[PDB]
A = this chain, B = another copy of it.
Amino acid sequence: GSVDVLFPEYDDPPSEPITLLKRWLATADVARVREPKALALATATSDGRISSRVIAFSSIDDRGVIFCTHSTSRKGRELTETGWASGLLYWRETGQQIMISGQAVPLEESENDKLWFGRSVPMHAMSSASHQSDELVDREALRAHAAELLALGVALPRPPRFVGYRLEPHEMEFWAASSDRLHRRLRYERDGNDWKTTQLQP
- Are A50 and B85 neighbours in the complex by a CB distance under 8 Å? yes
Q: What CA separation (Å) do A63 and B131 show in the bound complex?
A: 32
- Are A88 and B53 neighbours in the complex by a CB distance under 8 Å? yes
A158 contacts partner chain B, Cβ-Cβ < 8 Å? no
Among B44, B146, B185, contact of A48 (Cβ-Cβ < 8 Å): B44
Minimum distance in angstroms from A47 CB to a CB of chain B:
9
A199 contacts partner chain B, Cβ-Cβ < 8 Å? yes
Residues of the B chain whose Cβ atoms lie less than 8 Å from the Cβ of A185: 136
- Are B48 and A199 neighbours in the complex by a CB distance under 8 Å? no
Q: What CA separation (Å) do A50 and B132 show in the bound complex?
A: 23
Residues of the B chain whose Cβ atoms lie less than 8 Å from the Cβ of A182: 126, 130, 139, 142-143, 146
Q: Which of A14-22, A23-31, A35-43 has 4 or more CB atoms under 8 Å from chain B?
A: A35-43
Residues of the B chain whose Cβ atoms lie less than 8 Å from the Cβ of A90: 38, 40, 54
Residues of the B chain whose Cβ atoms lie less than 8 Å from the Cβ of A198: 135-136
Minimum distance in angstroms from A162 CB to a CB of chain B:
13
- Are B51 and A48 neighbours in the complex by a CB distance under 8 Å? no
In this complex, the interface size class of chain A, counting residues with CB under 8 Å from chain B, is: 35 or more
Residues of the B chain whose Cβ atoms lie less than 8 Å from the Cβ of A171: 49, 51
- Are A48 and B86 neighbours in the complex by a CB distance under 8 Å? no
Q: What CA separation (Å) do A198 and B126 show in the bound complex?
A: 20
A57 contacts partner chain B, Cβ-Cβ < 8 Å? no
Q: What CA separation (Å) do A126 and B126 show in the bound complex?
A: 50
Among B44, B88, B201, contact of A130 (Cβ-Cβ < 8 Å): B201
Residues of the B chain whose Cβ atoms lie less than 8 Å from the Cβ of A40: 40, 42, 52, 88, 90
Given contacts A51-B86, A53-B173, A146-B181, 12 further A-B contacts (CB under 8 A): A42-B50, A48-B83, A50-B84, A51-B99, A51-B101, A52-B87, A53-B99, A54-B90, A54-B97, A126-B182, A133-B200, A136-B200
Top 4 nearest A-B pairs (CB, nearest first) are A42-B42, A40-B40, A52-B88, A50-B86
